[PDB]
Structure 1
Amino acid sequence: AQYEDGKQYTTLEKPVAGAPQVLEFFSFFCPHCYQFEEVLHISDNVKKKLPEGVKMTKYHVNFMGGDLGKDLTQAWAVAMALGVEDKVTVPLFEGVQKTQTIRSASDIRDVFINAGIKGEEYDAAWNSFVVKSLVAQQEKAAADVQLRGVPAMFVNGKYQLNPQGMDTSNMDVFVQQYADTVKYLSEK
């Protein structure tokens, strides 16, 4: 076929019931994730090709960057609760990987403050039980699906994007192939 199991995607031996339709995992410490976000705009190009009625979910993971890694998962939970993903994603990536000015929870907080979220609003979110369960959701989703690497994308709890098998001579062509694959899997 043109799309084949084991080439543009892999199938999960152990499917996950009730998962979000399009589930993406990343880490602010993950260099390909940085590419995916700021150079390729993968999430965005996928959305643009998804049928609609389809929800996109993106979660942070713990297994990179130790203590800071966890702080970042809680901060992403804050970002999701407040709906400010689109204001902190870029400064968090660049603060971790470009300028290396993020070294403690306090520095993570500075990024939110600078993006215009109020201190009181951030600290209350940070400490809320709603953020606790949002942290729990992120961990459970990674747990359900075998996750030992990022960037990762899962479709309908059954298929896993396999980017190793798409030509990388041209970045634009890679993204489109990637996005078209998600759509195919979406319609499967």
Structure 2
Amino acid sequence: AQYEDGKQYTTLEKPVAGAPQVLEFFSFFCPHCYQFEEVLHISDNVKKKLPEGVKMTKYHVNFMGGDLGKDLTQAWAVAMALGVEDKVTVPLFEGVQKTQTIRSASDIRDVFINAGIKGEEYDAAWNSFVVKSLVAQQEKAAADVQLRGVPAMFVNGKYQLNPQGMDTSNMDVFVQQYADTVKYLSEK
């Protein structure tokens, strides 16, 4: 075929009931995630090609960056609850990987403040139980697929993108292939 199991995607030996339709995992500590987000805009280009009526879920994970990793997963939860993903994603990546000015929960918070979320509102979210279950969700969804690496994408809890099996010599081309694969898997 043109899309074959084991080359552009892999199948899960243990499918995941009631999973989000399109589920992406990343970490602000992950160098390819930085690439996927800042250079390739994968998440964005996928969305531009998905059929109507399909939602994208993106979750942060804990297994990179130790203590600050978890902080970042809680901060990402705050981003999702406040709906400010678009406003912190870029400075969070650059703060962890480019300028390296994020060294503590407090530095993470500065980014939200500089992105215009108010302190009171951030601290309130940070400490809220809505955020606690949002952290819970992120952890559970990674748990359901025994996630050991990022970046990672999963479609309807059954298929996993395999970027290793796509030509990277052109970046525009890698992205479209990736997105088109997600679209094919979506319709499967």
Provide the residue aligned with 1:152 in structure 2: 152
In 1, Cα distance between equivalents of 2:2 and 2:149? 26
Per-residue displacement from partner, 1:26-81 (whole Å, max 9, x unpaired)?
00000000000000000000000000100000000000000000000000000000
User: How far 1:84 sits from its partner (Å)?
Assistant: 0.1
In 1, Cα distance between equivalents of 2:146 and 2:153? 12
User: How far 1:128 sits from its partner (Å)?
Assistant: 0.2
SS at match of 2:124: helix
Relative to the length of structure 1, the TM-score reads: 1.00
In 2, Cα distance between equivalents of 1:71 and 1:115? 18
Q: Cα RMSD between the aligned structures?
A: 0.2
In 2, Cα distance between equivalents of 1:146 and 1:12? 10
Gap runs ≥5 in structure 2: none
In 2, Cα distance between equivalents of 1:127 and 1:66? 20
In 1, Cα distance between equivalents of 2:166 and 2:45? 16
Provide the residue aligned with 1:187 in structure 2: 187
Per-residue displacement from partner, 1:122-153 (whole Å, max 9, x unpaired)?
00000000000000000000000010000000
Tell me the percent identity: 100
Following TM superposition, the consecutive aligned residue runs of length 4 or more in structure 1 with deviations greater than 6 angstroms are: none
In 1, Cα distance between equivalents of 2:74 and 2:169? 36
Relative to the length of structure 2, the TM-score reads: 1.00
User: How far 1:14 sits from its partner (Å)?
Assistant: 0.1
Gap runs ≥5 in structure 1: none
In 1, Cα distance between equivalents of 2:92 and 2:56? 20
